[PDB]
């Protein structure tokens, strides 16, 4: 559930 | 302030090991008890654009680099640090953290720091141990590290030796 | 002894190719309209540093940095930059960027002119607070640029390193990501 924009 | 002491201590340790032909693998997260139990991924290591699977292999590559074709009185490889700089990129680092370390150290205490460290200097091949002018090859190097807290050493009573912050990521460039 | 093999740029920035999109924008704007990068990718928490790896004679960036430091002492004598050795926030970063020398970088198309290594890494803080962690993107650049010397009105050649740490942006930001950390290392400057 990581905030990952990449 | 805390980040600078941590960076200075790490830089002094890391390049001293290399220059004394000693291993640096113990400075990486891979061989840490707490991060291993927590399932931290292997340290991400790139050496001149080659992804290296483990700190142990990096130690072997350093050995191979220093192997001679050299006259007597020459040191095969010497790293000279010219500058470094450190930024905290997460002052509230929590991964694998003992609960007590979160409660006792707010992000302003300068303990639970994830740091971005950059280091630059020269690599001397075949130079006399204290010479910067009689080398065979001279490279510029640029190292970058992401450092994370060593939960097993930080404020561990009786811990005298050991690395306070460990390498989670490492990119090496020399040319 | 044999120096470690040198391989090309190692770009592992994940599905969205942020490193390509960011760096394309960055070095284009760095040359032509530097300050517009600040509202696009920088915020109140971004940290910036310039460090010198050598002592080139007539180093133009060194002169401008010394003038900046002097002026900062005149206007803001007890600013923490003295002991912290870094600049925090869009506002102060902009002032320094203004005095750093004008530059011309080669196109990113010239792959051999650039050494760019990047990878995604875990355990940044989530600025939205919705998740326990955020992913980060580390981008390290080694290259050369033309760097102006105003004393002669001529471009010299600068060798530099620049390490970016990118992460998810705060809510309401222009882009899904932001620069957390920007570390510029200036190596040799040689007159052309």
Residue numbers in the entry:
A (entry chain C): 15 to 20
B (entry chain B): 2 to 68, 76 to 183
C (entry chain A): 365 to 556
Paper text:
The TREX-2 complex integrates mRNA nuclear export into the gene expression pathway and is based on a Sac3 scaffold to which Thp1, Sem1, Sus1, and Cdc31 bind. TREX-2 also binds the mRNA nuclear export factor, Mex67:Mtr2, through the Sac3 N-terminal region (Sac3N). Whereas protein transport is generally facilitated by karyopherin-β family proteins, mRNA export in yeast is mediated primarily by the Mex67:Mtr2 complex or in metazoans by NXF1:NXT1 (Segref et al., 1997; Braun et al., 2001). Mex67 is a modular protein containing four domains: RNA-recognition motif (RRM), leucine-rich repeat (LRR), nuclear transport factor 2-like (NTF2L), and ubiquitin-associated (UBA).
